[PDB]
Design a protein around this ligand. Structure first.
Ligand SMILES: Nc1ncnc2c1ncn2[C@@H]1O[C@H](COP(=O)(O)OP(=O)(O)O)[C@@H](O)[C@H]1O
Ligand SMILES: Nc1ncnc2c1ncn2[C@@H]1O[C@H](COP(=O)(O)OP(=O)(O)O)[C@@H](O)[C@H]1O
Lengths: 22, 513, 485, 139
């Protein structure tokens, strides 16, 4: 007989940065 | 495939040859001296400089196993996969005989674990750290990595044991480039009337990997040039076509056509200035043996100043082309940014590029805009100007080696520059470019109309600039296209610089003297 | 595709018919050919013609026809195909839909895919001189390809396949196995069909057959014929003269454009500048790229010499081209001196434009077209000779022609003349004429809706299909009441 | 039923499809309707297991194999058409699509009449008005 399997690894996120204008 | 395919990287090739052959050819020697060598190399330099070729050549000439790993190739979005790939790669490499692993573009998988955000990259960095150095670190295996920017690597990776030595493979010089060119063309059949020395001198700013592309393009152009009228062997092969093959100068020139072309001929007048410039630019590179026996460095800086449209940038291009050096021309405002720390970053990047490919002529136009007097401005723009000026001061003459870089400034307001850029050792030479005289107008008319089908119009200028004469010539050419060059065009074109500027310039020239 | 066909024939004959000559020359770089371009150009047709013009082997491998599910079942299959193509004879391998087994190994997250692409790369790189095998690969998009596959050694020779005879041949091939008709002319179907490729002719034939079957069902096996009207209604149910006035100006512009291509220009005035730019882009037989004024610096990340830089790179890549710079004043604005963040951005944009416009030599046949209303705010550094010297200065007849072209596909009232509107409006423009026409149409639609509501109310307590099928003169006279300049 | 083609024993879905097609063929030129094909035909990007590949390939080869005397047709009904294995869309497998869209006002009136023709309607019913306010209603 066969069998199944579950897998959940990770994802990809987005960050936000701040700058300093002269 | 062999060491004979290596050109220009003499010292580095010999170094790597030693490090890989000594412990394989005569391990008993290292047992006698009682140490082990370092098993790790970090190649850094521009892309396409024989890194992979050198690695595979070393692997082939010394019986071993070569395993190639790509940076992005082994990276995986899924969890627990990248480090497993690295582990199995190292394991199978260790299963074979003495082997040489090669990691290409390692900086993509070594983000320093400092500014990185994701978790996979730091885990694979840790996996590399464990694989290279740990309990039972390695048993008779050599590891080589290749990168373009080596500073973006984990400091833990650049340590002894992991990567003991760090070889530098930069852009090859003239002799190395000639070696590479002859190495590639050796297989090709070369027709007569072609000289490799000139084709090596002309290809001054070529990294080395695209020399092969140049040769292939030249061969393709020749074969395409002898196929329009000759059949494509669609019926039977011929014997009169096999003979009389080989690339000529025209094919290589066309391939090179596929950083400006000036040969000291278009320039008219300014004889003494031309002589001084060629004198002070050529000896440092033409005959450096005389300098090194006299034990003294050469002067580097030059500064023109005067009215506009006189030929300053043209003179710079001509001197850059006379020598086989490169040429980086930038404008003043073209580098400024409204952000904080960006202008200085641009200056540093330009000078790092200049020093990385020597000899090099850097040309700064409108130096007044960029190197303004620090003095007192009490403003944010004042702060930015002061910072960029200081960056120029420390980059032209600071804690550097100053191997070979010729800085040439061209300005229009010589009074608006601080008395620290004009210090000898930065821009020691100050040479005023004046307006052309009657004989200079004869020379400029003769040199402008070289490939085209005069005293009367030379005496009818009375203090014009070369740009005006170029405008006259282009208008005449346009009317010729609309309609050989007729006299009526010049007659009708004659009909179609402030004195204050002249006064100021002469004032600064006399006060300077 | 005469030039592209000749190039492909040379690249498939010289490295396949005279290998000895290639070896004698000493260059063996030709091993991979790519074919990109818009869909429906004849890439599959060219591949079939190549395969049917040579007696060599033809091992076609599709994109998604390599995935199996077994451990390393795609790399082993690729290796087997390559070994068969190398063992049989010096031949060509056709890779259709290459956009499926090359996910760039950087955005993908699978495993088998990242192993196959590597297998294909190591199989294309592992071609020696004695193999004498070539590869041709077709793709739809020219951007979703791994740069490692396009490196020197695997894929270096790319073609951009951008006709009526082939369409007629395909039509006669498809319809030659059916009792179609006795009064049909496939030449008209091959000429009128423009964008069909491969399957569109088959779909047209199928729809014609279906319409023929439906025609002879509501009103018998041997009496069946797909007539010309069936194909006509299957095609119909499937898928410089517009600038009035300024005749001498447009003639001079066309002559100047033709002579240079046998650099730049700028328009200024009160008028139809965008109309003239559209007519040039339409009726010049050349490429055309148009951007807005402040739209070239809206890409961010130093758009100054980033968006404009990549625009100029795309322009120089597709030489010759026409760069329609709309609102040149808004972009240049005579940067001069501002001493601010906006001033710095404007100066950077101006410097990028100067360094990407003054660097155009006689090569690449570039041509920048600018347009403005107020020439006072244009930068004199860009109007200097040698960069952009032309100055095209931009009536009743032009207004009448614009009004007649705007009301082409419009049910106008027969009792209406547009000469009165042309004579009344003097300092108007095409935009104001369009606004007046739109106001008249809105008034007509309001009147029609009011009449329809009145008819519905009368029915709840019959006119024609439309109570006002055409726009009367009253609608125009009421729309011109609130018309400005 | 789409998700009902799997089985308990090792490798029985393929046999299930094979016997299904055999029964559909042997009896007559019948018509077979596969519901929720998306449940057993996802794009390769969304496939990680191995039984999915096996059953998909079995269905592909069954679809391709079509004798001239079979005279059997397949009816597919998926509400998620953008997540289907494109291999099924190739000519010879599934060429004719049927975009069953949202009806217009007349269609809504027709549906109203169809559904209301089996109930006691008061005299005041005016389905025409109802078929104008039910803007987005579908079926
Ligand atoms: N010194 C050299 N001698 C011969 N070929 C060279 C040399 N330097 C570079 N090349 C050529 O450069 C091309 C690409 O360079 P390579 O070292 O393979 O890659 P990369 O440095 O970009 O990782 C190869 O064709 C190699 O022949
Ligand atoms: N001696 C010269 N020889 C050739 N061209 C010259 C000469 N002097 C001036 N010109 C022409 O006149 C203009 C000189 O301006 P340019 O070279 O841009 O220098 P500048 O930096 O002083 O503005 C150019 O068009 C150049 O071609």
């Amino acid at each position: 007989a066969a069998a199944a399997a579950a897998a959940a690894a990770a994802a990809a996120a987005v960050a936000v940065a701040v700058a300093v204008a002269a | 495939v062999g060491y004979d395919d290596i050109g220009g990287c003499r010292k580095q090739m010999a170094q790597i040859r030693e490090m890989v052959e000594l412990p394989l050819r005569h391990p008993q020697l290292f047992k006698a001296i009682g140490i082990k060598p370092p098993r790790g190399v970090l190649m850094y330099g521009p892309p396409g400089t024989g890194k992979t070729l050198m690695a595979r050549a070393v692997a082939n000439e010394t019986g071993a196993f070569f395993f190639l790993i790509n940076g992005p190739e082994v990276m995986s979005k899924m969890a627990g996969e990248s480090e497993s790939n690295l582990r199995k790669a190292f394991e199978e490499a260790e299963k074979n005989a003495p082997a040489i692993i090669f990691i290409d573009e390692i900086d993509s998988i070594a983000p320093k674990r400092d500014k990185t955000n994701g978790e996979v990259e730091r885990r694979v960095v840790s996996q590399l750290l464990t694989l290279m150095d740990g309990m039972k670190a390695r048993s008779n295996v050599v590891v080589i990595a290749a990168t373009n920017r080596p500073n973006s690597i984990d400091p833990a990776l650049r340590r002894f044991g992991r990567f003991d030595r760090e070889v530098d493979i930069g852009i090859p010089d003239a002799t190395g480039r000639l070696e590479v060119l002859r190495i590639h063309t050796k297989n090709m059949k070369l027709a007569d009337d072609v000289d490799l020395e000139a084709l090596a001198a002309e290809t001054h700013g070529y990294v080395g990997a695209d020399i092969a592309s140049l040769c292939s393009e030249a061969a393709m152009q020749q074969i395409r040039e002898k196929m329009d009228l000759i059949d494509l062997d669609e019926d039977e092969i011929d014997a009169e076509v096999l003979d009389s093959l080989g690339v000529t100068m025209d094919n290589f020139r066309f391939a090179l056509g596929n950083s400006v072309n000036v040969t000291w001929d278009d320039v008219g007048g300014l004889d003494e200035i031309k002589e001084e410039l060629k004198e002070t630019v050529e000896y440092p590179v033409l005959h450096p043996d005389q300098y090194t026996k006299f034990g003294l460095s050469p002067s580097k800086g030059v500064l023109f100043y005067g009215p506009p449209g006189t030929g300053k940038t043209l003179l710079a291009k001509a001197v850059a082309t006379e020598v086989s050096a490169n040429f980086i021309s930038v404008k003043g405002p073209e580098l400024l940014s409204m952000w904080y720390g960006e202008s200085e970053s641009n200056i540093r990047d330009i000078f790092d590029k200049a020093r990385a490919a020597a000899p090099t002529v850097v040309f700064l136009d409108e130096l007044d805009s960029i190197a303004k007097a620090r003095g007192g401005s009490l403003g944010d723009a004042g702060g930015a100007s002061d910072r960029v000026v200081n960056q120029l001061l420390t980059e032209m003459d600071g804690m550097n080696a100053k191997k070979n870089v010729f800085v040439i400034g061209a300005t229009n307001r010589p009074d608006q520059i601080d008395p620290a850029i004009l210090r000898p050792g930065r821009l020691d030479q100050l040479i005023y470019v004046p307006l052309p005289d009657e004989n200079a107008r004869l020379s400029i008319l003769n040199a402008q109309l070289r490939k085209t089908p005069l005293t009367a119009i030379a005496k009818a200028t009375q203090g014009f600039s070369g740009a005006d004469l170029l405008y006259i010539v282009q208008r005449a050419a346009k009317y010729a296209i609309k309609d050989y060059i007729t006299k009526e065009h010049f007659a009708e074109a004659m009909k179609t610089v402030s004195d204050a500027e002249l006064r100021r310039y002469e004032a600064y020239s006399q006060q300077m003297k």
